[PDB]
Symmetry: C2
Subunit: 370 residues, 2 copies
């Protein structure tokens, strides 16, 4: 297994910072409140235009041309069109499968959002609220959704696997990130009582998700479990007989943490950090379960210095991380594409490196990975 991938962030699951136009004229910060700030016909028009334009067949041709073999697609819980006022997008996912199959790429379906949220992050669609796991109706809704998706795509050549939930927040991450202040909730009463998701509860959900997914996908397909921010917690759970050869652990690792931990802002120090904190630690998990780094990037404060120097640095950080991931089962860069405008929004300078295809065009990431 050598998964070389990109994420399709901000396509079917909106991330406000990655593109401004859909948010114009509203005060919404997240997916949940966007339709509440617009006339229904305007919301529909913007959503449908965004989904048609942001990712299309030509993007799959580009991803293949860069040497990737896989794509991770964040999908929303409302994909089947059964959760008003949100707009379904099963047709978009169907088209993605057709384009992946044309270009000999495989898709990891990533259920990125759930009703009432698994993390309270803005990327989860509902800022500052984290109550999904406390609401059995919505847990059951998600399990039914996962079953439907497995039945729909489980025999497809273009399926790599299914990830039952992105980024279920741990107690440590919930407290350390100060989630409800970092992503302040609009409805304070909706937010009160929110709780992080315990390891034991998550294992129980994973058991049920496996019961819905594994019987309904072909025997070469994978279930991909997010680490729930507990990289080293999963040996006993993921070495169970039912999972042998059928599972991948997804961990998300951002280079920017090096600076917070005191890494010197030189290439030599960043490369040592990548070797020690990323390669050396994560390969310990690879010993007993395949691991993909399902979100990572080259963002760093040093490059936020001439343009030539920042190009040199970005390229070396790309190569150093790619080298680390060669000791694992693979990776998905976060993210393939944004619509950032650092030329005119000067405060976003240093942040366009989260757009992988743009990194390639700037000389910040290798032109080909295979």
């Amino acid at each position: 297994m050598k998964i070389k991938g990109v994420n399709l962030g901000n396509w079917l699951v909106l991330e406000k910072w990655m593109s401004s136009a859909i948010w114009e004229g509203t005060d919404a910060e997240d997916e949940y409140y966007l339709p509440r700030g617009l006339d229904s016909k305007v919301y529909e028009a913007r959503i449908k235009m965004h989904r048609a334009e942001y990712i299309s067949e030509r993007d799959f041709a580009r991803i293949k041309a860069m040497g990737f073999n896989s794509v991770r697609i964040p999908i929303p819980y409302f994909i089947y069109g059964d959760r008003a006022p949100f707009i379904g997008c099963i047709d978009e996912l169907d088209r993605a499968f057709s384009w992946a199959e044309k270009y000999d790429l495989k898709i990891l379906i990533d259920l990125h959002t759930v009703p009432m949220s698994q993390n309270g992050f803005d990327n989860g669609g509902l800022s500052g609220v984290c109550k999904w796991a406390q609401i059995p109706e919505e847990v059951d809704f998600v399990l039914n959704l996962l079953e439907k998706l497995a039945k729909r795509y489980g025999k497809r050549k273009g399926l790599l696997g299914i990830e039952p939930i992105n980024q279920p927040v741990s107690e440590e991450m919930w407290n350390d990130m100060g989630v409800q202040k970092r992503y302040p909730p609009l409805d304070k009463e909706m937010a009160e009582g929110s709780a992080p998701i315990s390891f034991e509860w998550l294992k129980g959900f994973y058991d049920k998700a496996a019961d819905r997914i594994l019987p309904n996908i072909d025997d070469d397909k994978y279930i991909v479990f997010h680490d729930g921010f507990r990289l080293h917690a999963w040996e006993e759970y993921l070495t169970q007989d039912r999972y042998k050869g059928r599972v991948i652990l997804d961990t998300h690792q951002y280079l920017m943490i090096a600076e917070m931990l005191g890494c010197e802002q030189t290439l030599e120090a960043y490369k040592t950090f990548i070797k020690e904190k990323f390669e050396d630690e994560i390969t310990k998990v690879e010993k007993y379960v395949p691991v993909v780094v399902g979100q990572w990037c080259i963002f760093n404060s040093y490059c936020v210095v001439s343009d030539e120097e920042k190009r040199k640095v970005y390229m070396e950080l790309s190569k150093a991380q790619l080298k680390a991931w060669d000791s694992l089962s693979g990776y998905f860069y976060w993210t393939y594409k944004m619509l950032l405008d650092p030329t005119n929004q000067a405060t976003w300078r240093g942040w366009d490196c989260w757009d992988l295809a743009k990194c390639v065009d700037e000389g910040w990431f290798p032109g080909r990975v295979a």
Copy 2:
């Protein structure tokens, strides 16, 4: 600078065949009728999303990375926002200039559409109507618009030049192409009296446009005159002393026209046509005036056959035309980007080669 360019078709000037989402739920065939088929708030939402998503900074980075130095940007006559119900797009053009200057690209501003049309083509915004040149008030509107744009951008590092009007239709084109049957007018009364634009009228308009543009652009910038489908008509006009060093002739050349004229649909026949009808003829014009081939592509009916042979044919047609243009002042591929789905909408198989960036990714055009 040898001009190595791509067009930004379908960005600010819509062309229905290149993307479907904006037309959903309507039977509009062109720019003019789109707002007539939608609630105003829906039209505005769709136009604004399309313009934000279709072209952005990352596209200028890609164009530079692919080795181009120039973009040709079709703009609509309603760009300043003064022609209801259409939506202005000065901001978009201003952003294009900022991105071009960041990436060391130059912009040819191409006025692609005019009120009541210069060609009756769908790409002119109003199918089957061609009356602009018969309406002095709208000719004047266009002259004022060109003057404003020349003043706004004429001192900018990122400006290559200004093209006063795209594809003003000739008598021969109007007759031979059967424009009004190919692009039938929705409103027969509006279309009544449509007529092609004569060479003598066009030179008169060019004199007026040059008076609005040339005093307002710097000496390293150009007025770019479309040939009006008359490649060889311009020697006397464009060698006047006042135009020396300030002018480029824009000619549009499509390999598929060879098929209409009876060319065999083989690579060898296409290459012969490219050498004899493109290179050998257009280089005669380059001898007396700079020429750019402002729209061209690799579309051919042969490729419409194994994927590998299709790839080799496309790459050879790219290389053969690039070789032809090497003896000219430059070119702009039509077009940079489309949103076709040939996988699911098989009508478009063989047509995605009009998307230059996708050509590069398929190995149909040199990296």
